[PDB]
Amino acid sequence: GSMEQGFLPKGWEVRHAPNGRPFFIDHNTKTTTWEDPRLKIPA
């Protein structure tokens, strides 16, 4: 459905890596990911 990495879910942050690529930071379990949690639907 609607994705468009711009707004993130609760506990989810997004930052830029020195390489230029953006990565997501989950405040909940202190994990980082390069994958987009909006284009994948948890259900």
Binding site: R15, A17, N19, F23, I25, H27, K30, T32, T33, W34
Partner: peptide
């Protein structure tokens, strides 16, 4: 190819 900085690392 490289891992991203940890939350405590970037804070």
């Amino acid at each position: 190819t490289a891992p991203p900085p940890a939350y405590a690392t970037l804070g």
